Amino acid sequence: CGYSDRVQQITLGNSTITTQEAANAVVCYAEWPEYLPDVDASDVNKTSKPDTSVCRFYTLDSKTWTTGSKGWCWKLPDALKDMGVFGQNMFFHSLGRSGYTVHVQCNATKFHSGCLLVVVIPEHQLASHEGGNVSVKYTFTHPGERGIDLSSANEVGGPVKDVLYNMNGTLLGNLLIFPHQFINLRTNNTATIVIPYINSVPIDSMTRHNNVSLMVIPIAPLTVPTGATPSLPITVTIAPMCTEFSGIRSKSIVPQ
Amino acid sequence: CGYSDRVQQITLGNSTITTQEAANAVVCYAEWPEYLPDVDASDVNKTSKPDTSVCRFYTLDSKTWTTGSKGWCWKLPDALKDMGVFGQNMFFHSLGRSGYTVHVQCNATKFHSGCLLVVVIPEHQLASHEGGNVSVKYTFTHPGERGIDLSSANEVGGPVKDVLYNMNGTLLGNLLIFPHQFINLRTNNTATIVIPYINSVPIDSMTRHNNVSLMVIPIAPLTVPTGATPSLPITVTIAPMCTEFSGIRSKSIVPQ
Amino acid sequence: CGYSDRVQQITLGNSTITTQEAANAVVCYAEWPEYLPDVDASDVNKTSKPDTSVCRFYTLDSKTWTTGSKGWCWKLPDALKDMGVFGQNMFFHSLGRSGYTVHVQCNATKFHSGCLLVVVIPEHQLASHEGGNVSVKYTFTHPGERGIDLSSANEVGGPVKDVLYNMNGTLLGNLLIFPHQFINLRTNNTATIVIPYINSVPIDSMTRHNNVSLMVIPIAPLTVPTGATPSLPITVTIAPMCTEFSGIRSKSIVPQ
Amino acid sequence: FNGSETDVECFLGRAACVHVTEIQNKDATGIDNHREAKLFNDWKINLSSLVQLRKKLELFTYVRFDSEYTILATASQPDSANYSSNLVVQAMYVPPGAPNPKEWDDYTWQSASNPSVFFKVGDTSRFSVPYVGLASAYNCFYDGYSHDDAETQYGITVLNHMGSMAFRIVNEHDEHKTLVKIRVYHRAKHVEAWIPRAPRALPYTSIGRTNYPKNTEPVIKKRKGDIKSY
Fold first, then answer.
1. Where are the coiled-coil regions (chains A, B, C)?
2. After which residues is chain B broken (C to N over 2.5 A)?
3. Contact yes or no for A114/A256 (Cβ under 8 A)
4. Residue C96's beta-bridge partner residues?
5. Which residues in chain C belong to E strands, given as ranges?
C-alpha cells in the first residue's frame, strides 16, 4: 500500500477513461449538475431522460502546447455538434438542458516546466477582429473540435485573437472569478471543472445559443529541457451529466 | 512512515541478502516447498535433515544484459555442483529431494527501458545444434554458474542456441504456462519464483537428472539513455528450501 | 494522503521558516535547552525573560559549497554580534545564558552527490597559523556571519586553516563524539542540532567567551552532473531557545 | 455587517441621469422643424448610455430590476419670465412589444393601456415599472443570436427589451418660441444579481456587442522605475 489516488474505473457508457492524476475536484459553484427543473405539472410524465445514453466522455482532438502558443477556446454546447448521440439529439431536438463535466488533461513529463489556466466562462460574448460596431457572424465563432485556436491563427471578419482581452475586453489575471483551476506541472497534469446548467431561461436551444466558452491558456510559457520536443499535448474530454432535452414524442427528422 | 515494502532481514545461515524491491511473491503452483514425502515407516527415524545447513542463499555470477543479448539458461539442480555444502552433499550422496527458491535481481536505474521474462521450466529437455536424431552428450548442457548463455554464443555438437524455440521446439510467447514473472523496469527490478520439488520418482539423483532449467530472457530489448553504459547486470540467487537427502549413515567418500 | 513530514508552521516571532525535509531531530545530549538555573533566592523575582523576543530564527549568509571547498566555522555566541535584538542584548548586557537551536540547510537537487558533516564542538579552542607558543589575538577568530571560512582562505597571524586537525590538533573522522549529523544528499538536505547551554560557570559573558564553534564540512566531495553549476548553497539558521540574560534593571548604554 | 452599504441593492440602486433631451411645441407643421428633436421624442430605454458608461452592471452577468424613472422636466426657455403658462408635459412608458409613436399628434399617445402621465413643467413624476423581462433575469451579457431562423436583428439582443419612454407636449399656437428640457433619472429597486464577471479594460465602443476598442492605450500602469519600488 501507499498512494491511493482516485484512479479507479470511471466507466460510463462507451467511455472507460479513468485517467486521474491528483484527482481533486473543483465544481463551478455550490450547485451540482442537477436534473429536475421542477417537480411535476401534476401529470403523468414521459419526460425525456437521455442520461442513460448521453453521459459518455466525449473526448476532443488533442492540441499541441508549443512554446509559441497563446490559447484555445471552444464553445461548449456547440463544440459537440457533429458528433455523438448528443449532437444528433442537439440537431434532432431544438431545446435541451445540459450540465457538463470537463476534464482537461495535459501529458507532461517530470522535466517540463510551465503552467496552464483552465477557465469556464458563462455566456462568453466575443470581441471582434473588426473591433467596431460589428462582430463575428457566428461562422468563425464555434468551429467545433478545433476551437477558436488563439495561438497565432489570426483571421479577418470574425473574432479578435488578442489573449489579454480574451475576446471580452477583460483582463487576463482578472479572469479568475469564473470557475478555474491551474495546471501546474510541478503539482498536477490534469484539471476538472464541474459545470451545472446556467441560463436565465430554464430550457434553451443549443444550436442557437452558446452557453459556455471553455478556455485553456498558458500563463507561464512551457520550457522543455533542450534536446526534447518543444511541444506538449492537451486533451479535453466532456461528459455531459444530468442532461435533459425537451422535444419528447415530437421530432421526426430535420437534416442539415 | 510511508512505504513499508518487505525489505527486512531475510537472513538465513551464512546468507543475509534482504534486497527486495516490490517484494511480491509468485509460487510455482499451489504447492509450497514441503519436506515430508510421507509420514513414517512405523519406525524410529534418523532422517537426513540438512535444512539447518543447506538453506543458504547461494548467489551466482552476475551476467550483463546488453542490447545485443538473447538469454541465459542454467540447469537448476546441477548449476550448484562445484559449490557450497549443497554441492558436496550432491556428490557426497547420490539421491536428494530439493525444493528451490530463485530470486533473480536486475540492477536498473530509473532511466532504463526494457523488460525481462523469468521462467521456470520443469524437466526442460534440450534441442540440439545438430537438430537430428542426436542431442548434446551432457557436457555442454549444464556448465554450472555460467549457463548455456544463449546470447550469441553459438557452438557445435551440443544444444541449439535458437531463442524462439527455446531449445524445446516450443514458442516464445507461448511459454507462460510454466511459472514465470515479468521484470518490468517501469515497475520492478527483481523477480522471485518459489519452486517445490517436482519428479515422478519421490527421491532422485541430482548428479544424473536435471530437474529444472531456469531461463532469464529479454522480451523487450534494453534501451539505455545514450551516454550511459549499454549493459545492465542480472544477479540470480538460489535458496534451496526444505531440502532432503537420502544417503543417511551410508556415504564415506567419492572423489571426482 | 501519503507522506506527512513535519513541515508545518514553525513560526516564532518575526520568523516563519518551516522548511523541513525529513524533520528528524538530534539533540546534543539528554539535556534540553532549559531556562531555570535554580529555583529562587527565596525572593520576589524580576528575572530577565527575553524568550518572548529573542527566539527568532536568525538566519545567516548563504555559503557556496563548491567542489574545491574545505569547510566553514562560526563561533556561535559571537556569530550573532552585529545583528538582532540578541546582539544588542549581548553588548547591552554583559552576561547571558543562551541555549541554541541550529538548523543547517543545503539546497540540493536529486542529481547532486555528496555528503556533509555538521558538528557542534563545545569550547573549541583554536590552533594558530603560527603553530607555536602563540595563537590568534581574537580578531581573526570570530568575524561573525562570515566564519573562519576554511575553504582555501589562508592568512597570517591568526588560526590555521588545516581541516584534518580542525584547528584543534584532533582528527577528522575522530570528531564525532561531539554532537553531529551527516547531511547525505541521497537521504536528507538539512540537519538540526539542539544545543543546551554549556559552561562551568552558570552565567557568562558572550562578548568575551566563545561557547561553541559550529562547523559544516564536506567529508565527501560534491560531484554535480556536468553541465550544471559546480556550486551548492549552505544556509544556517540559529534560534536561541530558552535564552536568559543577567543585567536586569542595571544597564543604561554602552556604545561600541 | 448586515448594513445596506456594500450589498448589491445599495450598489446599483442609486439614481443617475440618463437621456438628456430637449423638445418643444410649435404648431401642426408651421416652420419646417418637426421630426428630429422637436414636438416629441422617443428613447427606447437602455441603461447602456450612462451607468458610468456601463460598468457596475457589466460587472455582473444576470440582473433583475424594478425601475423607478423619475422624469425631471424643465423649461429651457426662460421659465423665470414666462414660457411655462400651464405647459403640461406628457410622458409615456411604451412597454416592449407595443408600437412607438413617431408623431406628436399621433394615435398612440391616447390609445389604450399605455401608461402615460401628465405633470407641470418644472415638477417631477415618479414611476415604478415592474420587471419587464422576457428572460427571468435581464441578460445584460448574452452569447447567441435571436434565431438560426428569420433571426430578429442581431446579437444586440433587444429581445430582453426594458421599454420605451416617449415625451411630448400638449399645447398649441405658433407665434412664439418655447423649449423644454427633459431629464429622466433611472433607479433600480430590489436588484438581484448573478454570475460575477471580470471588469472591462477600456471604455466601450458599442452597445450590446462586447467589443473591445481598437487602437488602445495601455490600461495598466508601468512601474515607476523597476521592480524596485519607492
1. none
2. none
3. no
4. C204, C245
5. 26-27, 58-59, 63-66, 72-75, 95-106, 113-122, 180-184, 190-195, 204-205, 212-223, 231-238, 241-245
CA-to-CA dists, residue D185 to C228, D37, D70, D73, D182, angstroms: 69, 19, 5, 11, 10
Q: Under the phi-then-psi rule, with left for phi > 0, alpha for psi from -120 to 50, and beta for the rest, what region is D151?
A: left
Residue of C nearest to B1 (CA): C3
Pairwise CA distance, residues A219 & A118, whole Å: 10
User: d(Cα C118, Cα D227) in Å, to the nearest integer?
Assistant: 38
- Using a CB-CB cut-off of 8 Å, the residues of chain B touching A2 are 2-3
Under 8 Å between Cβ of C63 and C217: no
Name the pairing type of β-strands D180-186 and D40-42. Answer: unpaired
Distances from the Cα of A209 to the Cα of A78, A138, D147, D148, angstroms = 8, 10, 9, 10
- Secondary structure of residue C77 in the 3-state scheme: helix
The answer, for C227 touching chain A at a CB cutoff of 8 Å, is: no
Which amino acid, one-letter code, is at A94?
S
DSSP symbol at C122: E
Q: What are phi and psi of C177, to 5 degrees?
A: -80, -15
Q: Hey, are the CB atoms on D211 and A124 less than 8 Å from each other?
A: no
- Cα–Cα–Cα angle for C193, C198, C204, rounded to 5 degrees: 130
Radius of gyration of chain B from Cα atoms? Answer: 19
Residue of chain A whose Cα is closest to the Cα of B6: A1
Instruction: Report whether B238 contacts B112 (CB < 8 A).
Output: no
Antiparallel, parallel or unpaired: β C231-238 and C58-59:
antiparallel
Instruction: Mark which residues 1-30 of A lie under 8 Å from C by CB.
Output: 2-4
Q: In 3D, which of D155, D161, D159 has the Cα closest to residue D143?
A: D155
Angstrom distance (rounded) from CA A47 to CA D94:
40
Of A208, A185, A238, residue with least CA distance to A61:
A238
**What distance lies between CA B179 and its chain's CA centroid?**
12
CA pair distance D20, D167, nearest whole angstrom: 12
Report which of C102, C93, C109 is spatially closest to residue C240, judged by C-alpha positions: C102
Tell me how long chain C is. Answer: 256
Contact A62, A233 (CB under 8 A): yes
Asked if D66 and D98 touch (Cβ cutoff 8 Å), the reply is no
Q: Please choose, from the candidates C94, C93, C43, C74, the residue with its C-alpha nearest in 3D space to the C-alpha of residue C150.
A: C74
Reported resolution in A? Answer: 3.8
Cα pseudo-dihedral A219, A223, A224, A225, rounded to 10: -160
Spell out the residues 6+ positions from residue C49 whose beta carbon is closer than 8 angstroms to its own. C35, C244
φ, ψ for residue C166, nearest 5 deg: 40, 45
Q: What angle do CA B53, B58, B64 make, to 5 degrees?
A: 180
Quick one: which of A121, A112, A95 has its CA closest to A178?
Answer: A121
Strands B190-195 and B26-27: parallel
Q: What is the DSSP letter of B12?
A: B
Determine the Cα angle at A201 with ends A195 and A204, to 5°: 75
Is B61 strand, coil or helix?
Answer: coil
Using the structure block, give the residue that is written with the C-alpha cell 490534469: A190
Q: Is A110 an interface residue toward C (CB < 8 Å)? A: no
Question: How far is C207 from C80, CA to CA, in rounded Å?
Answer: 10
Solving technique for this entry?
Answer: cryo-EM
Phi, psi of B51 (to 5 degrees): -60, -20
Which of A123, A139, A198, A254 would best serve as a mutation to test chain D binding (most D beta carbons within 10 A)? A123
Q: Do A168 and D198 touch (CB under 8 A)?
A: yes
Chain B residue with CA closest to C6: the answer is B1
Distance CA B191, CA B214 (A): 12
Can you tell me the distance from the alpha carbon of D41 to that of D106, in angstroms, rounded to the nearest whole number?
12
Q: In terms of residues, how long is chain A?
A: 256
- Residue C66: which of C191, C224, C182, C189 has the closest Cα? C224
